[PDB]
Amino acid sequence: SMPPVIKIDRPFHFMIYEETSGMLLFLGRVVNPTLL
């Protein structure tokens, strides 16, 4: 009776996949989103 909440409020890893082939197009870590 209270939906889950996921808050990406700390360093995280990301992966962009093309799901048909299964190819990992991009792979990364974000440790601070306010800068390059």
Partner: protein, 349 residues
């Protein structure tokens, strides 16, 4: 009959393509591991594009030069010929079938004055990567820089305006591969709900960042071993972003345990539920000299005085790769994601 020989072959192609996807992911995770040893902080790169770049080199090498590249990419053998073209044809098809994907890739060969390339390598590069050849004068370094940066700026649509910084005058050939991904979220975030929020840099420090907000059906799971949430943020065209969030501030560094099996385990344990998601906007721009890193992955001889690139050039002997540079830029947004990677390989005399 006629089906028997082709039906067995389709099973084999299907198997081989799964094997290639798996190997490219693991190649990626190996790199992430190597890269992280020198660079703390934000990082981004393209495993797919990096391995296309290297297979471009590989076809061109022979002997220990070639076989070292196959090992580095995790390119293990397959069953029993001459069916490598069919494997690449199959990959293009799969990456072309869905018109909403928003993925384009391409390839350049920048060539030095009168440095004649072997015919079979030229052909293959067009057949496998649609490589475009452009004559060049690397002796006239400042001029070649401007001309090559124009070509990459065009194709990357303004997002990597200056891939090249310095030009080695002894350069005989440089191969650039690029990949462009324009993903739109399957359900975009409504920018009316983007708010400033607290991000935790570490256990003590924090910073304020724009957080995008969505509420609805999302697929996720919780790995109890690594103590992390994994979340799917789907794109149009059958692509997706996996996000892995550790619950505690590094502790068990995921980098060092990350494999195709771990990811497959997560994808198997996903469940879909109504939930609320806060997710920050970000731009990244990263640049990595792969030379020394690839050397650590066992790809040695391509960079040594004894490099054997005799399938790239008939006569030319004193050839070697001097630099492999990779530049990647990503922008995550309320509308989606836009990611560009450019990868260049300096072949020198």
């Amino acid at each position: 009959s006629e089906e028997k020989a082709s039906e067995e072959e389709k099973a084999w192609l299907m198997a081989s393509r799964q094997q290639l996807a798996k190997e490219t992911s693991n190649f990626g995770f190996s790199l992430l591991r190597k890269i992280s040893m020198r660079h703390d902080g934000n990082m981004v790169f393209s495993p797919f594009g990096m391995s296309l770049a290297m297979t471009g080199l590989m076809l061109g090498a022979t002997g220990p030069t070639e076989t070292q590249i196959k090992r580095g990419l995790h390119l293990q053998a397959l069953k029993p010929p001459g069916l490598l073209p069919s494997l690449f044809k199959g990959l293009r098809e799969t990456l072309s079938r869905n018109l909403e994907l928003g993925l384009t890739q391409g390839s350049f060969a920048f060539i030095h004055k009168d440095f004649d390339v072997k015919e079979t390598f030229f052909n293959l590069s067009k057949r496998y990567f649609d490589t475009e050849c452009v004559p060049m004068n690397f002796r006239n370094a400042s001029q070649a820089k401007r001309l090559m940066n124009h070509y990459i700026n065009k194709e990357t649509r303004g997002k990597i305006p200056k891939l090249f910084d310095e030009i080695n005058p002894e350069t005989k050939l440089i191969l650039v591969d690029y990949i462009l991904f324009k993903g739109k979220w399957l359900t975009p975030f409504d920018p009316v709900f983007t708010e400033v929020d607290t991000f935790h840099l570490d256990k003590y420090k924090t910073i304020k960042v724009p957080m995008m907000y969505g509420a609805g059906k999302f697929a996720s799971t919780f790995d109890k071993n690594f103590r992390c949430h994994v979340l799917k943020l789907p794109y149009q065209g059958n692509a997706t972003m996996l996000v892995v969030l550790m619950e505690k501030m590094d502790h068990l560094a995921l980098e060092d345990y990350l494999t195709t099996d771990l990811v497959e385990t997560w994808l198997r344990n996903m469940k879909t539920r109504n939930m609320e998601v806060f997710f920050p906007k970000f731009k990244l721009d990263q640049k990595y000299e792969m030379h020394e890193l690839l050397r650590q992955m066992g790809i040695r001889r391509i960079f040594s005085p004894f490099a054997d690139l005799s399938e790239l050039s008939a006569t030319g002997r004193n050839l070697q790769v001097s630099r492999v540079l990779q530049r990647t830029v990503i922008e995550v947004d309320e509308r989606g994601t836009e990611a560009v990677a450019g990868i260049l390989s300096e072949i020198t005399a």
